[PDB]
Amino acid sequence: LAVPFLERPPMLDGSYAGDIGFDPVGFSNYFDLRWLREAELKHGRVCMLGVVGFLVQEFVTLPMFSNGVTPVDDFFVVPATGLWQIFFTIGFVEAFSNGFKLTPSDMFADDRAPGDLGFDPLGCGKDPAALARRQLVEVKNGRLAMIAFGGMLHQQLLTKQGVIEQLTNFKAI
Amino acid sequence: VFPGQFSDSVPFLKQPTNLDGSYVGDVGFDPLGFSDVFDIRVLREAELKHGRIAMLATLGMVVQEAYTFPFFDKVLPIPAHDVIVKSGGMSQILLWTSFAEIFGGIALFQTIQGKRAPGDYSFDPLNLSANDLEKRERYALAEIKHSRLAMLAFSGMVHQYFITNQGVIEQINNFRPINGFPDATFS
Ligand SMILES: CC1=CCCC(C)(C)[C@H]1/C=C/C(C)=C/C=C/C(C)=C/C=C/C=C(C)/C=C/C=C(C)/C=C/C1=C(C)CCCC1(C)C
């Protein structure tokens, strides 16, 4: 149990990966646990790719664009047009992968697994025990990566330095 | 002097209605009857929270005058409050303690339901009194006595600084009476 001085939340049986009974504020109750699980997986995956993007944008820059001082400022130096192309592409992906159901009501109509968008092109998730281990690994890595992204974005905003550049040139504020 | 049942601490006041003696540190001292108006569990949790904060406060009020970190600056703690307010670190102390008290409030609301002991956050990483039960109540009595002593001590140190304008270590080595009373006339 993650919080020993509080009770185990009533809706956290332990079926999902990474469930250690950590919900003191009780979002498991009064909401849909599948919705929260898919939201957690989506945030984890987005930040998980975002950390790698912040690492790559320091040393690797696409020849079409001009690199900024920080990967945070790389959002501004690229033109406004093309940014909305990314916005609309993500909208199309989130519409087609979710089956054009986009609300807490109509989603999970077929009761699919939360976070299972049917995207396994390499076929890694075949063995169910390995599937559960990879579920746990993915969820814990997302829980680490969201905190990491929230840290590194603010570090790049405050110090105006890259993350590796900041780690090699550590200084007080 | 007259026959009758009274409290163990105060002999002219009766034992309070809700102070049965199960809780540690209970010598029957509740003259105004705070336990009659509010629950004893919430009061015990508030007492333990105040006492632990006061323990750390007395330790800080000693150490900060005894030894200041290489960062920040050499300054007395009472104006160091303002210094760290202007520096921004005290707002972060506030944020992190608020984040802890968010779960503390849920613990308190489960204490009213009677699911956890008041002030029992189950925090014993060194298992100093976890496996043994006889040591647990002795350490609880010691903790509550140190809590009350620390509240009194921090109040004393702060109000000594407020009129003396000297450090606690400074005052026990350079003890001067207040207001120039050694050679004061018509005071
Ligand atoms: C619960 C827990 C587990 C065990 C450890 C511990 C005891 C510490 C305890 C505490 C955990 C804590 C404190 C977690 C903290 C999480 C936090 C603060 C997460 C915050 C993340 C912030 C984020 C993403 C910000 C994202 C901003 C983004 C994208 C975009 C920025 C911008 C760009 C460049 C485009 C234009 C718009 C804008 C805004 C300028």
Side-chain angles (χ1 to χ4, degrees), chain A residues 22 72 75-76 147 149-150 153-154, chain B residues 96 99:
Chain A
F22 174 55
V72 176
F75 177 84
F76 303 91
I147 310 296
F149 192 90
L153 190 142
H154 298 100
Chain B
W96 280 97
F99 185 70

Side-chain angles (χ1 to χ4, degrees), chain A residues 3-7 22 24-25, chain B residues 103 106-107 110 115-116 120-121:
Chain A
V3 184
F5 55 92
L6 289 174
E7 74 165 18
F22 174 55
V25 194
Chain B
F103 310 127
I106 314 169
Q110 287 198 9
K115 300 194 175 187
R116 59 178 283 270
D120 183 16
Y121 297 92

Side-chain angles (χ1 to χ4, degrees), chain B residues 17-36:
Chain B
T17 311
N18 291 119
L19 299 195
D20 61 334
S22 60
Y23 288 85
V24 299
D26 184 15
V27 292
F29 178 70
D30 196 7
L32 281 172
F34 282 80
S35 56
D36 293 327

Side-chain angles (χ1 to χ4, degrees), chain A residues 23-77:
Chain A
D23 195 13
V25 194
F27 292 97
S28 311
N29 310 86
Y30 319 113
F31 277 103
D32 191 6
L33 193 54
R34 311 188 303 266
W35 184 264
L36 299 171
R37 171 57 52 156
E38 186 161 356
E40 186 183 18
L41 273 177
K42 187 169 299 181
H43 283 287
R45 292 161 180 172
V46 169
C47 283
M48 190 180 296
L49 287 188
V51 171
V52 184
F54 275 178
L55 290 181
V56 167
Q57 288 183 17
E58 315 279 3
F59 300 93
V60 180
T61 304
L62 291 179
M64 290 71 67
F65 319 100
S66 60
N67 190 14
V69 292
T70 52
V72 176
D73 276 3
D74 286 0
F75 177 84
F76 303 91
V77 292

Side-chain angles (χ1 to χ4, degrees), chain A residues 100-172:
Chain A
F100 297 97
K101 302 174 300 301
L102 313 173
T103 63
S105 292
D106 54 356
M107 276 181 59
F108 304 114
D110 53 356
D111 269 328
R112 59 175 182 87
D116 184 15
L117 302 181
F119 174 70
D120 194 12
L122 270 301
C124 295
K126 297 301 177 60
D127 178 73
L131 184 63
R133 190 198 70 89
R134 282 181 152 82
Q135 282 190 15
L136 179 55
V137 165
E138 173 189 23
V139 174
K140 292 192 62 177
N141 275 270
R143 292 169 177 175
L144 175 60
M146 292 158 58
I147 310 296
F149 192 90
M152 62 199 311
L153 190 142
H154 298 100
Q155 292 172 27
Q156 292 185 359
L157 260 183
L158 191 58
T159 67
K160 280 87 174 186
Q161 293 182 351
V163 283
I164 305 299
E165 171 173 296
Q166 186 181 200
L167 285 191
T168 57
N169 299 126
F170 212 91
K171 203 185 311 301

